[PDB]
Amino acid sequence: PKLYYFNGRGRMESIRWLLAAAGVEFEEEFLETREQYEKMQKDGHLLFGQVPLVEIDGMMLTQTRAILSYLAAKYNLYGKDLKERVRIDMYADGTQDLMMMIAVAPFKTSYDLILSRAKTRYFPVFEKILKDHGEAFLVGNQLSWADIQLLEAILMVEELSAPVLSDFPLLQAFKTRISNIPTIKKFLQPGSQRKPPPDGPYVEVVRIV
Amino acid sequence: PKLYYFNGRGRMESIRWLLAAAGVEFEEEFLETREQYEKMQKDGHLLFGQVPLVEIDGMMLTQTRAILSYLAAKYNLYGKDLKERVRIDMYADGTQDLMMMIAVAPFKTPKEKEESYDLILSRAKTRYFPVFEKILKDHGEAFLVGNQLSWADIQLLEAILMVEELSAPVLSDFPLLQAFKTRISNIPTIKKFLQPGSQRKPPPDGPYVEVVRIV
């Protein structure tokens, strides 16, 4: 893999996460300023003219959720059956939603709502999905790319309001046991590919391209 | 299947299309007003509390893109290999983008409305079509991915008509795509679904906006 995107989280972060959890080493190449983008464009790399771009298996993939489902299947993180995979995809969607609210929030002049939506909407669902089947994992007793989604979502909400999650026991226990999976652990250790929350001129590298 | 959603296009339209093209008969049940939604919610049907809802194979599937990929793979419209599938999925996402610009444009106020439509046109005429034109040119072929009807073809068509309704010319400058329209509109299942007494649903008007602001 060779990921192309900014030196920030955005739309790639969930991909880095999925790679990392797969135990797959990747290289990046940051879009710093304006000219870089216009070059990739006109060298025929960016399909519909927009990043992410992820060079992998000789192909230059380019639309976000497209790439996730290639990865998540290549490296066996989508279930066995369509019924398992649809549960994954469903979960993966909600989280995906939640995060993207956060990811886009810095560009405004919402956070208190994302909190209402996490505390009241998303977490309670995941909490009883874990409760109702007890199990260590979300779908079918195996590490699925949905678990990798939920965790990333948890810490992403946690970064805005750390308490947040106490009320959800099974989830606290989830966070622990999944953070302690070799690949996830290594990806969370201080000197990592993992990227920060959006700050200042992340927002303005991105407005300048 | 039993689709739940409004009596309008929105997020379900692309699902009805995919069902239709599969040669699969479906039943609907329209969300008319406020109370109906709050009932489905608290009877434990809506996972993260939001429609679409599509009852199928004994399961109550509920998040858009999650249902499309169940359908599109059950009824063999995703490729044979991951490399085909990802070409589908990549194409599926662009169209998906284009349409959802249109689908959400009615809920704005007027300057935004025009400024968005005229842009959707720029984006269709200058970004998405020219890409799909040469994908057809370069490989000549009748179909988008691997000489078979894939759910991407079903996506491109729906997108074409959807852009066409705003500005019918639009597409002259894309020969191969015109021909694309003709041949795919003439596939038995697509043909039937386009005949005037159909499940297919109209563009957003006023009312649709209103029912949807009132649930």
Burial class (CB in 10 A: 0-12, 13-18, 19+), B198: exposed
Regarding whether B181 and B83 lie in a shared domain, the answer is yes
Q: Domain containing B107 — which CATH number? A: 1.20.1050.10
List B29's β-bridge partners, or say none. B4
- A82-104 and A13-22 helices, crossing angle to 10°: 140
On whether the CB atoms of residues A115 and A123 are closer than 8 A, the answer is: no
**Does the distance separating the beta carbons of A47 and B131 come in below 8 Å?**
yes
User: Is B3:B56 a contact under the CB 8 Å cutoff?
Assistant: no
The helix or strand, by DSSP H or E, that contains position B118, with its residue range, turns out to be: helix B110-123
Query: What CATH number has the domain bearing residue B54?
Result: 3.40.30.10
Angle between helices B82-104 and B129-139 (to 10 degrees): 150
Residues A3, A66 within the same domain: yes
Q: Report, in angstroms and rounded to the nearest whole number, the Rg of chain A calculated over CA atoms.
A: 17
Q: Is residue B215 part of a domain?
A: no
- The Cα-based distances of B110 to A168, B107, B113, B117 in angstroms read 44, 10, 5, 11
* A209 within a domain of the structure (yes/no): no
Q: Give residue for tokens 């339209």.
A: B13
Flag if A89 and B69 touch (Cβ within 8 Å).
yes
Which residue in chain B has the smallest CA separation from A59?
Answer: B83
Chain B residue with minimal CA distance to A75? Answer: B82
Q: Which two tokens stand for residue B9?
A: 């296009």
For residue A206, is it within any domain?
no
What is the tally of structural domains in chain B?
2
Cα B134 to Cα B147: distance, rounded to the nearest angstrom: 15
CA–CA distance, A15 with B59 (Å, rounded to integer)? 29
Cα dist from B186 to B154, B164, B181, B194, B199, whole Å: 12, 17, 8, 10, 18
What DSSP character marks residue B105?
A: G
Report cis status (omega within 30 of 0) of the bond before B204.
Answer: no
SS3 assignment for A156-202: HHHCCCCCCCCCCHHHHHHHHHHHCCHHHHHHHCCCCCCCCCCCCCC
A26 falls within a domain? yes
What are the distances in angstroms from CA A170 to CA A61, A117, A137? 36, 19, 11
Host domain of residue A146 = 78-180
Vertex A57: Cα angle to A51 and A61 (nearest 5): 20
The reply to whether B98 and B165 lie within a common domain is yes
Q: How many CB atoms lie within 10 A of CB A199?
A: 9
* Contact present, A187 and A20 (Cβ < 8 Å): yes
Coil/strand/helix, residue B57: coil
Do residues B193 and B144 share a domain?
A: no
DSSP code of residue B106: G
Confirm whether B212 is domain-assigned: no
Structure determined by = X-ray
- Assess whether B84 and B164 both reside in one domain: yes
Indicate left, alpha or beta for A22 from its phi (over 0: left) and psi (-120 to 50: alpha).
Answer: alpha
Q: Do A149 and A155 touch, CB atoms closer than 8 A? A: no
Strands A2-5 and A53-56: antiparallel
- d(CA A24, CA A21) in angstroms, rounded, equals 7
Same domain, A83 and A141: yes
C-beta of residue A92 within 8 angstroms of C-beta of residue A78: no
Where do we find the tokens 């699925």?
A144
Do residues B20 and B57 make contact, with C-beta atoms less than 8 angstroms apart? Answer: no
Using left for φ > 0, alpha for ψ between -120 and 50, and beta otherwise, residue A164 falls in left
Instruction: Compare CB distances from B63 to A64, A69, A93 and report the shortest one's residue.
Output: A93
**Is A207 a domain residue?**
no
Q: Do A66 and B90 touch (CB under 8 A)?
A: yes
Same domain, B56 and B113: no
Sheet order of strands, B27-30 included:
B27-30, B2-5, B53-56, B59-61
Regarding whether B110 and B162 lie in a shared domain, the answer is yes
* B106, two tokens: 């009615």
Question: In B, which residues are within 8 Å of A67 by CB distance?
Answer: 86
Contact A79, A86 (CB under 8 A): no
User: Do B105 and B44 sit in the same domain of this protein?
Assistant: no
d(C-alpha B42, C-alpha B40), whole Å: 6
A28/A194 Cα distance (integer angstroms): 11
Question: B residues 152-171 near A, CB within 8 Å?
Answer: none
Same-domain check for residues A72 and A164: no
In a domain, B211, yes or no: no
Residue B141 lies in a domain: yes
Beta strands A27-30 and A59-61: pairing type?
A: unpaired
Residue A10 and residue A30: Cα distance in Å, rounded? 13
Same domain, B48 and B60: yes
Indicate whether B12 and B84 sit together in one domain.
no
